[PDB]
Design an enzyme around this catalytic site. Structure first.
Site, PDB file in Angstrom:
ATOM      1  N   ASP B 139      26.917  64.904  35.426  1.00 49.17           N
ATOM      2  CA  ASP B 139      25.510  64.955  35.836  1.00 49.17           C
ATOM      3  C   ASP B 139      25.169  64.417  37.182  1.00 49.17           C
ATOM      4  OD1 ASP B 139      22.905  65.641  35.577  1.00 49.17           O
ATOM      5  OD2 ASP B 139      22.607  64.274  33.815  1.00 49.17           O
ATOM      6  N   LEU B 175      22.164  73.006  40.439  1.00 52.49           N
ATOM      7  CA  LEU B 175      20.986  72.687  39.835  1.00 52.49           C
ATOM      8  C   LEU B 175      20.199  71.558  40.608  1.00 52.49           C
ATOM      9  CD1 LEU B 175      18.324  71.973  37.988  1.00 52.49           C
ATOM     10  CD2 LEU B 175      20.068  71.102  36.059  1.00 52.49           C
ATOM     11  N   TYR B 176      20.858  70.427  41.010  1.00 51.28           N
ATOM     12  CA  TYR B 176      20.217  69.374  41.717  1.00 51.28           C
ATOM     13  C   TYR B 176      20.146  69.602  43.403  1.00 51.28           C
ATOM     14  CZ  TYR B 176      20.471  66.094  37.729  1.00 51.28           C
ATOM     15  OH  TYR B 176      20.489  65.534  36.363  1.00 51.28           O
ATOM     16  N   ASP B 200      16.674  72.015  32.355  1.00 59.03           N
ATOM     17  CA  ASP B 200      16.986  71.623  30.981  1.00 59.03           C
ATOM     18  C   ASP B 200      16.401  72.915  29.952  1.00 59.03           C
ATOM     19  OD1 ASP B 200      17.771  68.962  31.873  1.00 59.03           O
ATOM     20  OD2 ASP B 200      19.123  69.912  30.490  1.00 59.03           O
TER      21      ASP B 200
HETATM   22  O1  LIG Z   1      20.047  62.802  30.931  1.00 62.36           O
HETATM   23  C1  LIG Z   1      21.380  63.537  30.887  1.00 62.36           C
HETATM   24  C2  LIG Z   1      20.754  64.864  30.800  1.00 62.36           C
HETATM   25  N1  LIG Z   1      20.000  65.113  32.122  1.00 62.36           N
HETATM   26  C3  LIG Z   1      19.734  66.395  32.249  1.00 62.36           C
HETATM   27  C4  LIG Z   1      20.816  67.542  32.024  1.00 62.36           C
HETATM   28  O2  LIG Z   1      20.575  68.658  32.455  1.00 62.36           O
HETATM   29  C5  LIG Z   1      20.935  67.391  30.639  1.00 62.36           C
HETATM   30  O3  LIG Z   1      21.822  68.407  29.871  1.00 62.36           O
HETATM   31  C6  LIG Z   1      21.925  65.956  30.647  1.00 62.36           C
HETATM   32  O4  LIG Z   1      22.542  65.714  29.266  1.00 62.36           O
END
Ligand SMILES: OC[C@H]1NC[C@H](O)[C@@H](O)[C@@H]1O
Ligand SMILES: *[C@@H]1O[C@H](CO)[C@@H](O[C@@H]2O[C@H](CO)[C@@H](O[C@@H]3O[C@H](CO)[C@@H](O)[C@H](O[C@H]4O[C@H](CO)[C@@H](O)[C@H](O)[C@@H]4O)[C@@H]3O)[C@H](O)[C@H]2NC(C)=O)[C@H](O)[C@H]1NC(C)=O
Ligand SMILES: *[C@@H]1O[C@H](CO)[C@@H](O[C@@H]2O[C@H](CO)[C@@H](O)[C@H](O)[C@H]2NC(C)=O)[C@H](O)[C@H]1NC(C)=O
Ligand SMILES: *[C@@H]1O[C@H](CO)[C@@H](O[C@@H]2O[C@H](CO)[C@@H](O)[C@H](O)[C@H]2NC(C)=O)[C@H](O)[C@H]1NC(C)=O
Ligand SMILES: *[C@@H]1O[C@H](CO)[C@@H](O[C@@H]2O[C@H](CO)[C@@H](O)[C@H](O)[C@H]2NC(C)=O)[C@H](O)[C@H]1NC(C)=O
Ligand SMILES: CC(=O)N[C@@H]1[C@@H](O)[C@H](O)[C@@H](CO)O[C@H]1O
Ligand SMILES: OC[C@H]1NC[C@H](O)[C@@H](O)[C@@H]1O
Lengths: 391, 390
Positions: B139, B175-176, B200
């Site tokens: 992540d 994503l980030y 998410d």
């Molecule tokens: O906090 C952890 C969580 N952050 C956001 C992610 O997209 C999600 O899948 C991950 O497990």
């Protein structure tokens, strides 16, 4: 409306949300608005236990008219899609031991565009009464000013009463008045068995949420008008269709009973899951919707993405609906002291709480002092009945 | 990522969406992140036919850490909720014939707040490799600037390769990176077995729609990068839970196969409908997600609240998914000429079309000249397989 009718909230079925204005009988015969459609829905209601459940009004909606009126001045059915006319459809329906509902508009056109009732109020009413109609949905598209909406709505009520026939009058007066000024529900209550309040309904947990949310929002204004012979209409039961998951279908059922909403199924009856049938035909839950006392429920509490509804029933009974609005994770625990339930009455000195939804389950006794624990499903609802006793 | 792994998109299960960061073992023991949770999910995947279906990776997500590292050095499990350590969990998991996945962060903290991997990249990697981890979700919370995101993501990939261990590396790089600048998917592909692209996922038909809608929106940019060893991740399979109706759950299954998305179930395996079990374990439909060719599908057409997707499969085969986005009324008819299908190859001179979803049903032969007719359910999807003559 002091007419002897809708002493409890009307139950029956209505084509609109599922069958909408499909008039192509050529390529989509199994869903065009044809007499056969109602012939078949009616036929079923009987055999599948919909009548015993207490659904009684087979209701035609918009898109049953001919292009224009005969030469007197009377509304006709479609010659193609309704060859036999309403006269016979009525006869047939009745022989099944059901009541038939029909549609028309306050305006110059229905919301689809078929002739309105304006100028023709006196004559439509009688025309319907000659047919053997037992309900009217009176829509309010195609209206210049509030003054016409108001006089039109009222004027029809009178014309129906005069006919001499028991005809449930269901109005959309407030919905259309809304965008301009608050409706006088006290006054509306005087002329209509029940009134449509908010936007149309979809096959969406979204749409549901927004109805409850908007309903609960201005409950101060509507909950109190509600009682025997006049109801708040939050629109059709969409359970059985496609859009809602199980827990969302319960949420619907529970809160329609809580809200003392009429129960109008809009679905193909001919293809419905055991799931939903059994839900739609829940004795206990129809009861709560159908409670003779007739007081509307309301939103006791809210926050933490949880919602508490409750409805008082006769005999010192009360219904508690608990919603879970978090869409993510799992079953969440929610708890309150029964001291806060039913204004404090049910459960003094104690109450018997059995769970009706999502599944039917007795829970023990419950002293005044005690708290009720519970695990509610994301977007589902838990539905309790609290009884008095004494033990 | 040229690592021998994810030759077809990874299948398994992931705690997050259903169980989230529940660390209250006292009042909610059945759902707190405990070894017994994974001990139980593992145990089932086996017996319920999840393995035979092809789900192989039992994946721990966020919220498995201790407060801080040992001294060394190294990340620890929770002493309370993971008393036996990951070492043993791995051992157990493997003995079932399954592979364990774990979670960590590029940053200074996980998205929850437990230690990040930054500065510790080399050491985390090995740590995991000692434990027998077979997957990493990396992540990207808690990151100052894009430079650290980029270098951090990359640096881990090397550290993992070096361990000497087959470890499927799953990254959240794009994503980030998104909200600041377009990601170099060409580059990402080079370091990651699959990458998370969008927000998410929820237990909502909403959330689904927005994912497909966002994906199809920029397919130009992402459909081509996808193939053996590197996948676009549209987030977890949520079927089995509460929020989606049947035709919404099919829509999810079909379009995950069409998209060549990995299949990560996030649900309580211990309470799941026959409905959903059968849908999640659909042979034919897993096949399509699993096709060895590995070309991602895409949105062929759209309009009239109807949506046409298609994926090319090896052997002159193709998948066609048609979605119906009108949330009102009933089954809608939608048709096109098979001449438009699969760029014009499947169905020249003809094809055999058998329907997979919502119900498995053969439909006849289909000459070049013919059109395919169909009644799709509101918010459902109809999912076809075209075999060209020939
Ligand atoms: O906090 C952890 C969580 N952050 C956001 C992610 O997209 C999600 O899948 C991950 O497990
Ligand atoms: C249209 O015209 C008038 C306009 O309102 C309407 O007259 C009303 O009809 C109802 C029909 O029942 C009458 O209400 C009754 O009142 C008497 C008591 O005086 C009772 O006999 C009736 O009791 C029944 O319902 C009770 C209430 O819950 C039950 O407890 C009980 O079990 C009874 O079955 C009922 O209360 C009302 O008196 C008149 N009002 C007028 C104008 O005097 C009329 O019915 C309408 N006609 C048509 C064809 O639409
Ligand atoms: C994690 O946080 C620390 C901050 O304590 C980062 O280290 C500092 O980051 C800034 C850049 O914004 C530098 O100017 C400082 O020189 C660093 N400080 C010290 C004391 O070393 C670290 O890089 C962060 N990393 C990420 C990926 O977010
Ligand atoms: C680390 O990187 C190398 C090179 O990318 C990987 O080598 C590839 O691995 C697969 C399986 O061994 C082979 O099919 C390819 O032929 C390899 N290509 C190259 C460049 O040699 C290697 O597998 C990775 N090793 C580990 C254990 O992570
Ligand atoms: C995104 O990054 C990729 C991967 O690094 C870039 O492609 C490389 O570019 C260098 C020169 O800068 C070449 O020598 C390499 O051969 C390229 N790598 C491979 C194997 O493709 C790419 O140019 C970047 N994309 C864009 C459009 O900015
Ligand atoms: C309810 C309504 O607006 N009815 C209209 C009326 O306003 C108008 O006098 C005439 C011409 O438009 O036809 C009718
Ligand atoms: O067709 C317009 C429409 N407005 C609202 C009502 O739900 C519907 O039955 C009426 O016919």
């Amino acid at each position: 409306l002091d007419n002897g009718l809708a002493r409890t909230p009307t139950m029956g079925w209505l084509h609109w949300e599922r069958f909408m204005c499909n008039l192509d009988c050529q390529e989509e015969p199994d869903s065009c608005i044809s007499e056969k459609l109602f012939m078949e829905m009616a036929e079923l209601m009987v055999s599948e236990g919909w009548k015993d459940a207490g659904y009684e009004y087979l209701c035609i909606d918009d898109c049953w008219m001919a292009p224009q009126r005969d030469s007197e001045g009377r509304l006709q059915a479609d010659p193609q899609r309704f060859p036999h006319g309403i006269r016979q459809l009525a006869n047939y329906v009745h022989s099944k031991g059901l009541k038939l509902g029909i549609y028309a508009d306050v305006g110059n056109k229905t919301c689809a565009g078929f002739p309105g009732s304006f100028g023709y109020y006196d004559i439509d009413a009688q025309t319907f009464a000659d047919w053997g109609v037992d309900l009217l949905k009176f829509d309010g598209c195609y209206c210049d000013s509030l003054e016409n909406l108001a006089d039109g709505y009222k004027h029809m009520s009178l014309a129906l009463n005069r006919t001499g026939r028991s005809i449930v009058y269901s109005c959309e007066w407030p919905l259309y008045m809304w965008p301009f000024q608050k409706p006088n529900y006290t006054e509306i209550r005087q002329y209509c068995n029940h009134w449509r309040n908010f936007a149309d309904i979809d096959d969406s947990w979204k749409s549901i949420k927004s109805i409850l949310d908007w309903t609960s929002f201005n409950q101060e204004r509507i909950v109190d008008v509600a009682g025997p012979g006049g109801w708040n209409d939050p629109d059709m039961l969409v359970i059985g269709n496609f859009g809602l998951s199980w827990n969302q279908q319960v949420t619907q059922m529970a809160l329609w009973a809580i809200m003392a909403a009429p129960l109008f199924m809009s679905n193909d009856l001919r293809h419905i899951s055991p799931q939903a049938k059994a839900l739609l035909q829940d004795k206990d839950v129809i009861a709560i919707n159908q409670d003779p006392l007739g007081k509307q429920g309301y939103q006791l509490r809210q926050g933490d993405n949880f919602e508490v509804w409750e409805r008082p029933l006769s005999g010192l009974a009360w219904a508690v609906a608990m919603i879970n609005r978090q869409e993510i994770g799992g079953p969440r625990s929610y708890t309150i002291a029964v001291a806060s339930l039913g204004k404090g009455v049910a459960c003094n000195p104690a109450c018997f709480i059995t769970q009706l939804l999502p599944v039917k389950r007795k829970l023990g006794f419950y002293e005044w002092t005690s708290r009720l624990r519970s695990h509610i499903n994301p977007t589902g609802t838990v539905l309790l009945q609290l009884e008095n006793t004494m033990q």
